[PDB]
Scaffold this active site. Structure first.
Site, mmCIF file in Angstrom:
data_model
loop_
_atom_site.group_PDB
_atom_site.id
_atom_site.type_symbol
_atom_site.label_atom_id
_atom_site.label_comp_id
_atom_site.label_asym_id
_atom_site.label_seq_id
_atom_site.Cartn_x
_atom_site.Cartn_y
_atom_site.Cartn_z
ATOM 1 N N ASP A 35 0.850 -1.210 0.000
ATOM 2 C CA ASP A 35 0.000 0.000 0.000
ATOM 3 C C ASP A 35 0.879 1.251 0.000
ATOM 4 O OD1 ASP A 35 -1.968 1.865 0.245
ATOM 5 O OD2 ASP A 35 -2.614 1.258 2.260
ATOM 6 N N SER A 199 0.372 15.409 -12.397
ATOM 7 C CA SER A 199 0.216 15.020 -13.799
ATOM 8 C C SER A 199 0.061 16.269 -14.658
ATOM 9 C CB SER A 199 -1.000 14.084 -13.957
ATOM 10 O OG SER A 199 -1.298 13.824 -15.282
HETATM 11 C C1 LIG Z 1 -12.004 -3.417 1.641
HETATM 12 N N1 LIG Z 1 -11.763 -2.692 2.915
HETATM 13 C C2 LIG Z 1 -10.496 -3.170 3.622
HETATM 14 C C3 LIG Z 1 -9.291 -2.711 2.841
HETATM 15 C C4 LIG Z 1 -8.639 -3.573 1.978
HETATM 16 C C5 LIG Z 1 -7.467 -3.193 1.353
HETATM 17 C C6 LIG Z 1 -6.958 -1.916 1.547
HETATM 18 O O1 LIG Z 1 -5.857 -1.497 0.857
HETATM 19 C C7 LIG Z 1 -7.596 -1.049 2.413
HETATM 20 C C8 LIG Z 1 -8.760 -1.445 3.044
#
Ligand SMILES: CNCc1ccc(O)cc1
EC number: 3.4.23.22
Length: 330
Positions: A35, A199
């Site tokens: 992430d 961008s």
């Molecule tokens: C779908 N909600 C949980 C979630 C899943 C993945 C994420 O990167 C953030 C939150």
């Protein structure tokens, strides 16, 4: 040092990608969602409320000879979709793709929200935004990348996400075989703790390129491309029967449509998102209304270049003293 790991879409829509991560000694392998929009490495664990665990693989610190409680430390995070998680903290050895960090903060969930419990394929998150966003209190912790940096051959990681296919996260090197042409680098602001960049504009399908500055973040943890309402309306106006639905929560289109491409600018370079990448399929099983992959950022407060955009490119996250982003076609 370097590392290289394969990232795999969790489902047939590429909602998210999971990458295997080794935690502890002996290794416990958990599938995490890398992430670039957050800065916590947190896992489902032996501490997670049992009713909130449904099929995830858990980290058990008591089975790791290298796990140490980070005494007093807690964490709590919420994500854009209203999901959240919180718990306590261990330090342990964490390896990604052969690259090992000792003493990494591994945030053990005591509580997760419903949309985590309901997704059995995600065993936690590995944050790759700047460590200034890390939620551990009272002592903020470093990301896996910030802890690895000094050991890496080059202070970089790369995201090469697949369309309906696996891809790769690399740490410490740039695979010159993984992209076509040249990488165009662009400036990053770290003021909000994100990989925030500007961008240079957009085009819809074969249309003329509109030169316009669009601030946003490069976020591997977001599925969709979230852009200003002007831009998004210009895109969907090219799809007959597309409309914004308050009931569904964004732009929908007839499943019979052929979608146009979307181009975004990186300096003088251009990344083309094929139309197919913008199709996220029926809104509900059997529906003939399909959900769009380009949505308005109005009310989010930031534009987000999520996986729809990033999967069209080879993306370099350059964590040198002056951070930059690079984009290449592939
Ligand atoms: C779908 N909600 C949980 C979630 C899943 C993945 C994420 O990167 C953030 C939150």
């Amino acid at each position: 040092s370097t590392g290289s790991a394969t990232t795999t879409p969790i489902d047939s829509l590429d909602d998210a990608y999971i990458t295997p991560v080794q935690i502890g000694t002996p290794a416990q392998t958990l599938n995490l969602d890398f992430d670039t929009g957050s800065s916590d490495l947190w896992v489902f664990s032996s501490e997670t409320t049992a009713s909130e665990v449904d099929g995830q693989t858990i980290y058990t610190p008591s089975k790791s000879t290298t796990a140490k409680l980070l005494s007093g430390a807690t964490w709590s995070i919420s994500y854009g979709d209203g999901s959240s998680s919180s718990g306590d903290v261990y330090t342990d050895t964490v390896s990604v793709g052969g690259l090992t960090v000792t003493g990494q903060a591994v945030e053990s969930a005591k509580k997760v929200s419903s949309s985590f419990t309901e997704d059995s394929t995600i065993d936690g998150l590995l944050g790759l935004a700047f460590s200034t966003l890390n939620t551990v209190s009272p002592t903020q912790q470093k990301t896996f990348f910030d802890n690895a940096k000094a050991s890496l051959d080059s202070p970089v990681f790369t995201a090469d996400l697949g369309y309906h296919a696996p891809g790769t996260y690399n740490f410490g090197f740039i695979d010159t075989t993984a992209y076509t042409g040249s990488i165009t680098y662009t400036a990053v602001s770290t003021k909000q703790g994100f990989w925030e960049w500007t961008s240079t504009g957009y085009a819809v399908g074969s249309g003329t390129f509109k030169s316009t500055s669009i601030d946003g973040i490069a976020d591997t943890g977001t599925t969709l491309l979230y852009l200003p309402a002007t831009v998004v309306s210009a895109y969907w106006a090219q799809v007959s029967g597309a409309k914004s639905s308050s009931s569904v929560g964004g732009y929908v289109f007839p499943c019979s449509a052929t979608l146009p491409s979307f181009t975004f600018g990186v300096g003088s370079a251009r990344i083309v998102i094929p139309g197919d990448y913008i199709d996220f399929g029926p809104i509900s099983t059997g529906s003939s209304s399909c959900f769009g992959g380009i949505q308005s950022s109005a009310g989010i407060g930031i534009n987000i270049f999520g996986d729809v955009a990033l999967k069209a490119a080879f993306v370099v996250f350059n964590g040198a003293t002056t951070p930059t982003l690079g984009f290449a076609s592939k």
